[PDB]
Design an enzyme around this catalytic site. Sequence first.
Site, PDB file in Angstrom:
ATOM      1  N   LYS A   1       2.464  12.118   6.205  1.00 60.91           N
ATOM      2  CA  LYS A   1       3.760  11.556   6.169  1.00 60.91           C
ATOM      3  C   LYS A   1       4.894  12.313   5.515  1.00 60.91           C
ATOM      4  CE  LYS A   1       5.792   7.049   5.200  1.00 60.91           C
ATOM      5  NZ  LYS A   1       6.013   6.076   4.463  1.00 60.91           N
ATOM      6  N   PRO A   2       5.895  12.595   5.937  1.00 60.98           N
ATOM      7  CA  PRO A   2       7.012  13.772   5.349  1.00 60.98           C
ATOM      8  C   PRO A   2       7.425  13.126   3.996  1.00 60.98           C
ATOM      9  CG  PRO A   2       7.940  12.949   7.444  1.00 60.98           C
ATOM     10  CD  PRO A   2       6.369  12.405   7.364  1.00 60.98           C
ATOM     11  N   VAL A   3       7.977  12.132   4.014  1.00 59.72           N
ATOM     12  CA  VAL A   3       8.693  11.329   2.845  1.00 59.72           C
ATOM     13  C   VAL A   3       8.008  10.054   2.564  1.00 59.72           C
ATOM     14  CG1 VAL A   3      10.990  10.922   1.820  1.00 59.72           C
ATOM     15  CG2 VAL A   3      10.661  12.678   3.888  1.00 59.72           C
TER      16      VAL A   3
ATOM     17  N   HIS B   1       9.520  -3.063   4.920  1.00 60.46           N
ATOM     18  CA  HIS B   1      10.065  -1.693   5.188  1.00 60.46           C
ATOM     19  C   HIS B   1      10.823  -1.236   3.982  1.00 60.46           C
ATOM     20  CE1 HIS B   1      12.577   1.730   6.891  1.00 60.46           C
ATOM     21  NE2 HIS B   1      13.649   0.914   6.679  1.00 60.46           N
ATOM     22  N   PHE B   2      10.629   0.129   3.638  1.00 60.27           N
ATOM     23  CA  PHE B   2      11.519   0.912   2.444  1.00 60.27           C
ATOM     24  C   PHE B   2      12.540   1.408   3.178  1.00 60.27           C
ATOM     25  CE2 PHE B   2      12.069   1.770  -1.935  1.00 60.27           C
ATOM     26  CZ  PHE B   2      13.140   2.833  -1.712  1.00 60.27           C
ATOM     27  N   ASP B   3      13.950   1.070   3.122  1.00 58.28           N
ATOM     28  CA  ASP B   3      14.657   1.771   3.967  1.00 58.28           C
ATOM     29  C   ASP B   3      15.558   3.026   3.072  1.00 58.28           C
ATOM     30  OD1 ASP B   3      15.980   1.265   6.429  1.00 58.28           O
ATOM     31  OD2 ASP B   3      18.224   1.171   5.442  1.00 58.28           O
TER      32      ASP B   3
ATOM     33  N   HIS C   1       4.187   1.621  -0.854  1.00 60.61           N
ATOM     34  CA  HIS C   1       5.438   1.685  -1.821  1.00 60.61           C
ATOM     35  C   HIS C   1       5.245   1.134  -2.976  1.00 60.61           C
ATOM     36  CE1 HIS C   1       7.486   3.279   1.584  1.00 60.61           C
ATOM     37  NE2 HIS C   1       7.271   2.151   2.280  1.00 60.61           N
TER      38      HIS C   1
ATOM     39  N   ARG D   1       8.288  14.289  -1.316  1.00 61.19           N
ATOM     40  CA  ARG D   1       8.859  14.794  -0.070  1.00 61.19           C
ATOM     41  C   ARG D   1       7.947  16.157   0.293  1.00 61.19           C
ATOM     42  NH1 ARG D   1      13.224  14.177  -1.351  1.00 61.19           N
ATOM     43  NH2 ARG D   1      13.412  12.668   0.151  1.00 61.19           N
TER      44      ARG D   1
ATOM     45  N   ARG E   1       0.711  -1.132  -0.012  1.00 68.26           N
ATOM     46  CA  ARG E   1      -0.039   0.121   0.053  1.00 68.26           C
ATOM     47  C   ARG E   1       0.608   1.298  -0.046  1.00 68.26           C
ATOM     48  NH1 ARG E   1      -1.926   3.022   4.114  1.00 68.26           N
ATOM     49  NH2 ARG E   1      -1.561   1.213   5.892  1.00 68.26           N
TER      50      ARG E   1
ATOM     51  N   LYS F   1      19.757   1.274   7.483  1.00 71.44           N
ATOM     52  CA  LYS F   1      20.378   2.645   8.004  1.00 71.44           C
ATOM     53  C   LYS F   1      20.367   2.606   9.475  1.00 71.44           C
ATOM     54  CE  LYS F   1      18.896   5.936   4.410  1.00 71.44           C
ATOM     55  NZ  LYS F   1      17.971   6.626   3.920  1.00 71.44           N
TER      56      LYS F   1
END
Length: 124
Positions: free
Chosen positions: A41-43, A119-121, A12, A85, A10, A66
């Site tokens: 959501k900021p990014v 998760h997208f890192d 990404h 962004r 959903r 990260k």
Amino acid sequence: KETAAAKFERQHMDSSTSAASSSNYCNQMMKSRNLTKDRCKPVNTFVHESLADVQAVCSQKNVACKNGQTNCYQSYSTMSITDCRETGSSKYPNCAYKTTQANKHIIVACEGNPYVPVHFDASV
């Protein structure tokens, strides 16, 4: 509740387009995927590839995330991505984003059985 794997899709995945086609792509997608429901959501990053090709990254190059975790994986190939962004005029509930289209390797964290992205890192 929504599974981590489903949430990754959903947040990404956008296999329905090859690239962002206009500066309004992020505004539309952030809203339609319900990423602005509670807060802006900021990014966020969308990946324009088949779900199978993105799931396959969990069997590619193991790398540290990260934050130091070691269940991250980097794609061998570059992929079509869109970076979203938040802009300076963004104000909840009217969240606003700048759209940037790019071709980069992606780094995801993988969990589970089947072993899939959750998760997208990063993109590099």
